[PDB]
Amino acid sequence: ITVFSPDGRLFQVEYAREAVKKGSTALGMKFANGVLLISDKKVRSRLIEQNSIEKIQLIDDYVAAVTSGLVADARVLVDFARISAQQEKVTYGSLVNIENLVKRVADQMQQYTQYGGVRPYGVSLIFAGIDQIGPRLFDCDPAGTINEYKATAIGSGKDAVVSFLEREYKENLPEKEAVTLGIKALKSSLEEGEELKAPEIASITVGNKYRIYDQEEVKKFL
Amino acid sequence: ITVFSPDGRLFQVEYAREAVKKGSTALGMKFANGVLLISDKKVRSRLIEQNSIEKIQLIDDYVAAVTSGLVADARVLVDFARISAQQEKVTYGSLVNIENLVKRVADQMQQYTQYGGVRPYGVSLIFAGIDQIGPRLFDCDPAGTINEYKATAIGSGKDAVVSFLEREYKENLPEKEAVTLGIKALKSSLEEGEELKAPEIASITVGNKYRIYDQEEVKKFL
Amino acid sequence: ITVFSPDGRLFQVEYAREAVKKGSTALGMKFANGVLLISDKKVRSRLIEQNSIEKIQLIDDYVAAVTSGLVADARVLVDFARISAQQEKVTYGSLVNIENLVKRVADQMQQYTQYGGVRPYGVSLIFAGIDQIGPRLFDCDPAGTINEYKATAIGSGKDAVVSFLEREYKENLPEKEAVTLGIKALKSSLEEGEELKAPEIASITVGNKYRIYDQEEVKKFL
Amino acid sequence: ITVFSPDGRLFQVEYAREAVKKGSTALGMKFANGVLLISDKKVRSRLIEQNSIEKIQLIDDYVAAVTSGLVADARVLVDFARISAQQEKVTYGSLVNIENLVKRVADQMQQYTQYGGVRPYGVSLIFAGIDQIGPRLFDCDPAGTINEYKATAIGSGKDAVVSFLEREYKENLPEKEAVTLGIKALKSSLEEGEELKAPEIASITVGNKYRIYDQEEVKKFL
Amino acid sequence: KRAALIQNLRDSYTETSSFAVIEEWAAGTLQEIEGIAKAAAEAHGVIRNSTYGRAQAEKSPEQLLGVLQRYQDLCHNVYCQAETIRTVIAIRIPEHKEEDNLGVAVQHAVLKIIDELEIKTLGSGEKSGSGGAPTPIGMYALREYLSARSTVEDKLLGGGSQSPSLLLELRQIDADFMLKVELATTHLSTMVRAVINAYLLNWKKLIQPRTGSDHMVS
Amino acid sequence: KRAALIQNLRDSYTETSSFAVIEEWAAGTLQEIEGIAKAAAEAHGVIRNSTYGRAQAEKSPEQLLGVLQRYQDLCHNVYCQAETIRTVIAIRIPEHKEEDNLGVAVQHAVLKIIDELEIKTLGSGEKSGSGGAPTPIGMYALREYLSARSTVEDKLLGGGSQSPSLLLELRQIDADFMLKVELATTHLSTMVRAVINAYLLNWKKLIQPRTGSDHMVS
Amino acid sequence: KRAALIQNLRDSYTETSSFAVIEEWAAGTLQEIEGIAKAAAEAHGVIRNSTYGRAQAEKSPEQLLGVLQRYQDLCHNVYCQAETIRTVIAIRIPEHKEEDNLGVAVQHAVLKIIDELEIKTLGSGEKSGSGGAPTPIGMYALREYLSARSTVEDKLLGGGSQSPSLLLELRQIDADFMLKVELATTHLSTMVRAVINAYLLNWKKLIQPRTGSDHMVS
Amino acid sequence: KRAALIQNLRDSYTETSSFAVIEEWAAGTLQEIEGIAKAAAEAHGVIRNSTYGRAQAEKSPEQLLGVLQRYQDLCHNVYCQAETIRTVIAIRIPEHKEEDNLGVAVQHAVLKIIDELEIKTLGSGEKSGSGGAPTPIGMYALREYLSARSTVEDKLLGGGSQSPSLLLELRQIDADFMLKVELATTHLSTMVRAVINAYLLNWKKLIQPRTGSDHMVS
Amino acid sequence: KRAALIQNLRDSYTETSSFAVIEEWAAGTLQEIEGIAKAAAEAHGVIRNSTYGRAQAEKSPEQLLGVLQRYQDLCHNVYCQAETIRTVIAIRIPEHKEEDNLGVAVQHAVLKIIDELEIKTLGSGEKSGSGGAPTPIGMYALREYLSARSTVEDKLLGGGSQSPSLLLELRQIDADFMLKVELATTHLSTMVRAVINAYLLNWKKLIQPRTGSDHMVS
Secondary structure: OOOOOOOOOOHHHHHHHHHHOOOOOEEEEEEOOEEEEEEOOOOOOOOEOOOOOOOEEEEEOOEEEEEEEEHHHHHHHHHHHHHHHHHHHHHHOOOOOHHHHHHHHHHHHHHOOOEOOEOOOOEEEEEEEEOOOOEEEEEEOOOOOEEEEOEEEEOOOHHHHHHHHHHHOOOOOOHHHHHHHHHHHHHHOOOOOOOOOOOEEEEEEOOOOOEEOOHHHHHOOO | OOOOOOOOOOHHHHHHHHHHOOOOOEEEEEEOOEEEEEEOOOOOOOOEOOOOOOOOEEEEOOEEEEEEEEHHHHHHHHHHHHHHHHHHHHHHOOOOOOHHHHHHHHHHHHHOOOEOOEOOOOEEEEEEEEEOOEEEEEEEOOOOOEEEEOEEEEOOOHHHHHHHHHHHOOOOOOHHHHHHHHHHHHHOOOOOOOOOOOOEEEEEEOOOOOEEOOHHHHHOOO | OOOOOOOOOOHHHHHHHHHHHOOOOEEEEEEOOEEEEEEOOOOOOOOOOOOOOOOEEEEEOOEEEEEEEEHHHHHHHHHHHHHHHHHHHHHHOOOOOHHHHHHHHHHHHHHOOOEOOOOOOOEEEEEEEEOOOOEEEEEEOOOOOEEEEOEEEEOOOHHHHHHHHHHHOOOOOOHHHHHHHHHHHHHOOOOOOOOOOOOEEEEEEOOOOOEEOOHHHHHOOO | OOOOOOOOOOHHHHHHHHHHOOOOOEEEEEEOOEEEEEEOOOOOOOOEOOOOOOOEEEEEOOEEEEEEEEHHHHHHHHHHHHHHHHHHHHHHOOOOOHHHHHHHHHHHHHHOOOOOOEOOOOEEEEEEEEOOOOEEEEEEOOOOOEEEOOEEEEOOOHHHHHHHHHHHOOOOOOHHHHHHHHHHHHHOOOOOOOOOOOOEEEEEEOOOOOEEOOHHHHHOOO | OHHHHHHHHHHHOOHHHHHHHHHHHHHHHHHHHHHHHHHHHHHHHHHHOOOOOOOOOOOOOHHHHHHHHHHHHHHHHHHHHHHHHHHHHHOOOOOOOOOOOHHHHHHHHHHHHHHHHHHHHOOOOOOOOOOOEOOOOOOOHHHHHHHHHHHHHHHHHOOOOOOHHHHHHHHHHHHHHHHHHHHHHHHHHHHHHHHHHHHHHHHHHHHOOOOOOOOOEO | OHHHHHHHHHHHOOHHHHHHHHHHHHHHHHHHHHHHHHHHHHHHHHHHOOOOOOHHHHOOOHHHHHHHHHHHHHHHHHHHHHHHHHHHHHOOOOOOOOOOOHHHHHHHHHHHHHHHHHHHHOOOOOEOOOOOOOOOOOOOHHHHHHHHHHHHHHHHHOOOOOOHHHHHHHHHHHHHHHHHHHHHHHHHHHHHHHHHHHHHHHHHHHHOOOOOOOOOEO | OHHHHHHHHHHHOOHHHHHHHHHHHHHHHHHHHHHHHHHHHHHHHHHHOOOOOOOOOOOOOHHHHHHHHHHHHHHHHHHHHHHHHHHHHHOOOOOOOOOOOHHHHHHHHHHHHHHHHHHHHOOOOOEOOOOOEOOOOOOOHHHHHHHHHHHHHHHHHOOOOOOHHHHHHHHHHHHHHHHHHHHHHHHHHHHHHHHHHHHHHHHHHHHOOOOOOOOOEO | OHHHHHHHHHHHOOHHHHHHHHHHHHHHHHHHHHHHHHHHHHHHHHHHOOOOOHHHOOOOOHHHHHHHHHHHHHHHHHHHHHHHHHHHHHOOOOOOOOOOOHHHHHHHHHHHHHHHHHHHHOOOOOOOOOOOEOOOOOOOHHHHHHHHHHHHHHHHOOOOOOOHHHHHHHHHHHHHHHHHHHHHHHHHHHHHHHHHHHHHHHHHHHHOOOOOOOOOOO | OHHHHHHHHHHHOOHHHHHHHHHHHHHHHHHHHHHHHHHHHHHHHHHHOOOOOHHHHOOOOHHHHHHHHHHHHHHHHHHHHHHHHHHHHHOOOOOOOOOOOHHHHHHHHHHHHHHHHHHHHOOOOOEOEOOEOOOOOOOOHHHHHHHHHHHHHHHHHOOOOOOHHHHHHHHHHHHHHHHHHHHHHHHHHHHHHHHHHHHHHHHHHHHOOOOOOOOOEO
16 A cells, blocks of 8 residues: 555555546636635435535635545545644634645645555545635645646546636636636536536635535526 | 555445445434434344344434444444533533534544454444434445435335335425335335334434334334 | 455354354243343263353352353453443442443454454353343344343254244243243253253342352252 | 565665656756756646746755655655754754755655555655755665765656766856756756756855746746 | 447347246256157167167168257257357456456356356367367267268178177167267256256346445545 | 557557447348358258258258358458457557556457457367367368268268268268358357457457556656 | 246255265165176186187177176166256355355365266266376276277188287287276275265255354344 | 677677567568468459369469468568567576566567467467467468368379269368468468567567666665 | 264275275285286396297287286286275265365375376276376286287288388387386386375374364353
8 A cells, every 4th residue: 555566656546546536526716816616516316415515615714625536535634624724723823825734634645655554545635715825726636746726626527627627717717707617617527418407616705705605696607 | 454446446345335235224204393213123033122122222312323234333333422422512511413423423434444453334324313403314334424314224125215215205294294104115125025013213303302102102103 | 354255244253153153052031020041061071070160150149141152262251241240330339231231241242353453252142130120131142242032042052942942932930930941942952862961050030149059959950 | 665685675665766767857966156956847737836836845045955756755755854954953053064964864764665564755855055064965765875966866857867967067167057057958858849848946055045046037048 | 339339239138038048948948858868768778679680780770860869959959048148148248357346257157157068068069178078979969870870880781791799889889879868968957957046046147247336435 | 760660550450440340240240140040040951851862972062052151251251350359459558567457457358259259269270279169160161061071972972882871971961060050150149249248348448558647756 | 936946946856866866876886886896707707717719709798798788777877866966966056156155165076076976987978088087997888898899800700810919809808898897896886985975974065055144234 | 708608699689680570570571461361362262253173183273372382481481580589589588586577577478479479370380289270371381282182182083083072172172271361361460560569669678678776785 | 864874884994994905015915016027027038038030920928918917917906905995085085174174185195196006007097198108008908918919910920011120029019018017017016115105104184084172162
């Protein structure tokens, strides 16, 4: 699990990544003075309570995450991120750079790829928020590898969504236009004939706290 | 016990789930201001005591669980939920959101899928009760995966019962009509010519504490 | 040892059950205001101190156990049951419900099927006594699975003994009639023309302590 | 992972060195009263935020590192090095010889080739800075082997860059000419018809703190 | 379109096609096999009650020819019916993987008992291998018998041959070929029964060797 | 230039080449096979109904040769077509390694069954292994039929043989060769179906057995 | 209905059918083998102290045909009886699994000893494996004998041969075939006895390979 | 001097010798094989529209003899060219060790496929092994052809045979040998293409199977 | 009933039945083998000082027949005796398990060396395996000789062969078959002595392969 192959590969980590590819698609993008997240939900049965166990999880008022891959692994990691954010705020009085929070989470993941008696987390996360530097968007994978982005995606439709954004994405769009772009990007990832039900959507702009779009505001984009 | 396969699967957890498909069938469903649970059981012998029968366990006065799979594993997780519920009541003076209890139980199960030197719990659980949000119904599986439901089932008859409920379930039924619906649902999971003996039934409504339907009250629904 | 098979089985646990099957037959039954245990001695060699390494063991004055399977594992579990009874009595001043004691023993057995680094106990037990609820009878297997009974058996002759009790067992018998039915049941488990030589018998009724029958008292029943 | 082959090789360490060969190219060289570092960047797409996940990492004001191989493993060593630098400064008031810091990092890497239950770090590092002896340039590999250099390289283009420097390198160049030579050595390692996108550059001269060339400073070389 | 192509294969050869065969094997096939066995036992009695002269080398005994013929038509049908089952399993061997192969292992186990039925039991192949021909007699038994009787017929007819044993060989060829039909039908009955049990115990994994919906990932 | 040599190979034999074969096999080829089985069954009944005399040894039946020729032509086409698929896979077997071989294993698994189709099922080789020939008849069925029949013909025509079984054997060769075609086309239908399924389920790993670019390193 | 199809199979061949065989084997079978062994031994002594001329090439000895014939009928009974034991086990081989196969292993081990009895001891196969034929004589011993003696008869009867060793060789075919019956019956005795022991030690797992109802999971 | 002896083997057969083979195989060799397949196809169609009288047994057909000669030359050339590549790899098999064997396993895997090309595909050996001869025709096809044709010719020419199938067989020997070239050339093309891809992907480890300098020690 | 049937077998063939064979092998059996070896070496010394004419072809040498007859009888006895030991072991092979097989392993290893003795050393099989026949001659050596000698006699007598080497070969058959008895008896000596040792060292586990009764459970 912590073993190099002859070519220098960590096969357990690359298998952890296969688990991530099975999760549903989520994306984030920076726009003029803000950042947003959009999560696809395949919600299934009418017997489910849809009003809970959400894909977009607030880490605090200024930072949110969405995950893909093993659901239980993901929850434990989101818990870790919340607590770790709180420890930083207690220590310094605030959280100046979200990048340090993402590194602490990614360090926890890296460690489960290096020590024996433990498997990697089968998870990918996107973190989005505003710190003292500005709006931020990062991703993080089973290995603890991180990147900061203008736009990005995770889950089964990752590659479709990113192909679309490479062509279509422009910096500094208004919130409404960015949401539209995102909704469109997400649609591109679907099988044709396959329709897109109520995605989760959340955004934040400089000077404010996160808003989660209510079920009504999301429709106006579908 | 904690290894990814090339396709990102955790086979030990998938096998622990096979253990759950062998247990007796239980179900829960929300109704008008309330939630109930119904458990089947195969008592073989007449030499067995009925009434010490350990199925539908109260966690506290407002929360109950049924389980399926390995009965000894299940008993350990029900003790964990009981103690964990008490620790929350002592810390905050009450239990505001049953979902946090279910997460602690599920987090305990996830860890046994991640750390070596230990096997997963071969158990699924349903938790039902009332908190500040209202009536809740959750399930939880060997991986520590949880969902909130309108109605659900676990055990060997799971698939039939869910199919039935998917066609027959309606919200905001009166308790009487819900219990009746649950009994029909459970009966539909049986062998042909196989009679349903007395199941356990428990319900709770907003502003009350759990009631266990006694031996004779149950019989009225058969 | 702590591993699921693809069908969800714990083979080490199932193999520990095989060692239990090789042990001597014992049984217990509830009767009018009481409960008894009968244990087939199955001795050989006039060189052994008969009436020394007793199969029926007092846990306290109100609770006894009989075991089957590996004798050394069994001794360890009985010692654990004794210390665990005293701990409860020191804490609360008395032991209100024998089931909790049985659960503590069962939990210790369960742990040994879940954690690597140990094998299960190759032991089954019957616990019989009187608590604040009435006369009690439980059994407990290598998995830490437990049941409450009106009558039950463990060991090589279990199936015959249960089969026989399933026919002949009547509820609220006088002690002397209960003991006879028990000797009857135990005889039926022997191979053709095999001879039952002095079992251990112990009994207890509400308001008294246990009595172990001595050798002269058992012969009267043969 | 901590095991000798019949010829006395540590294959796990050699496999970790394979991972290092896939990393992006970087180099350092001492010049007149100074030392510099230049890193190539495998730039994903325009969606990647460039201000970010720098290849050149300052360890303190007088010391910097650049790494190649597993990016999460490298991040962990770079954190370790920063803290280890601060611990020396607290202990003695300053950091007299940079080689003791590189040895502390290399010791930590050496351990992960000797104790079981961990894998080696899949990382090589170049450290460059000024101490009491003067300008310093070391490298460090997955085994914890260290060398001091005049000029050196790591990553995929290592062998190309090194052969170029072996012909082209001259001691005591002025900074401008050291940088120009470095850019040349990097271009030498590129696939024909592939274009140098614009590296990271950083230099330090005696008496001074590190400078990180900005994008338009690097432009005058590309 | 690739899924359409796959689905058209599987629609054409379904669990019903192979169940139909197994149902026929459990009833009519086994009865026919008993009949043929009785007929060979009868012919074998008649040959035991006989002395042979070159009149026996001059005519080819139509009763044996009909027992052998009836055995061959039986083998022919069992073969074609076996192939129906092989097809049903073979077009459902799932995507090649190094995991989730418990069902795939059932498919290969049942394909193997069926290959033994066709290859070893029914001797359907042009050539047997270094395993041998472990059935008493195969699909081309009639041709085997005729060519074995031919040889001795030629030798005896030519005066032909004086040898007293050669003449008894002619009768023994007639007898042994009836014996072989008696033994082979017994051996085939067992194999057909072995496969009825194998198929009916395992058909669910034969048809749907993987069940691939997890709730661990979202 | 080494890369261009490989790219010319792969440009000439693309996934399109092998898919065309599988499309043809799923439609026309299976129908032609069934057709040969019907004709062989037709010709077989004709022989079952006949009394053979010496006239039958003086002419070789045009009907049976027509069936055997049809079987040979079909086998020829399938062999060539199977080699198009083998080429497509075989030129995409990647750099030899001790790792990242899950797709390579698929490639080898699918080549094995195509080999079996060619070597075993079609009996296209000059000599069989110690596995033998488990197919009823092979590619060179015309030649095997003519060779078996000519032997008996020469013995019959001389003065010819007086053996009554030998004239019956002339007839059994005619019947058994049509039976062999019926059985072989059936076996071959199964093999072709197995391969259609194997290919269509596994085709992406057949063409790209490795997908190799980590985000772990730089 | 599938469970009924299985139940009917198992009701037709019960543990009683196979026990009955073993009871027969332990008693009458072993006695008849000893019978055949003595008969052959007397027929070997008769040929030993005996001189041959071409009057022995003019008749086939009836004492010898009778021994071989009696041996063949015995082999025929053992074979058919062995098939009964194999049907009893084979139709009780349970659902194919990667676990819980300790009884299944017992089933296969006994099936294997039965096949060696059928295939290798009784030489019942028409063509034996690369391992050869380790039994001294098989089921088709009578045919073997007449074939071997006939060759030597035609050579002697003719203008005959004047080779003194060929005439002694007719003597040796007679002797050796009786020797081979003495050897083969002794060998067959061991096998039958080994199978009575194996069956009687293992019959419970043979009939019921898995006992499965856990109390862990409710 | 030992190292000088090794240096001279290696300088005499280099990567350039083996590369030149691969170059020639990608272009000229595959064109030639295509040329032969056409000639065999053309020749086969001529025989297909032909009735054969005894005149056909009197003259050996030069068109076929030439197609086969041409095929043989090509096989000969491929065999010597394969031996060049085999030599380049084989004289670079490094010191025997129980480690550092990844380049070596590449060398063994390429050598194995060249073995197959030389032994199986080209049928170069004088005796094929236990896995017979998989290729439709080998290196000595001309001699196989002439030997088969002349047994028939000789039987047909004088007192000759009246067998009508014998006459058809002569034509079938002519047709089949042309078909076997059509098949053999397609199969050879696959193998040659497989070897080009294998060599070009692996040539670096074929030449330097170990690149072994550590910085770990001093 | 079941245990009685097993008991009857084990009462009939006890360790005393196998020890008695071994005692007999250690003493008389080995001396009879030296006997035949003396007899053969001298008959070989006669044939060596011998020039052969046509007269040696008109009479089969009675001393050689005698040496060979003697060898055959010995082999008959040893085979039969070997079968008594195999019976003692084989009827004591315990219930089939995946555990407690250390004595069972002793039983199989000893059974292997007895099969080697019977099958490979004594050539008792009617047909060899692909392991050939490592013994210089087997059980049916007399018949081997007569057949070999009969062939060359026929050739020499006729208008018969003028080859001088065919005359030398008749003598070479006479010598070689004696040489072969010298070798086979030596080889047989080693094997008998290997089995005496193997039996005597392993006999306890041979009879009681398990001592099963732990004190652990009650």
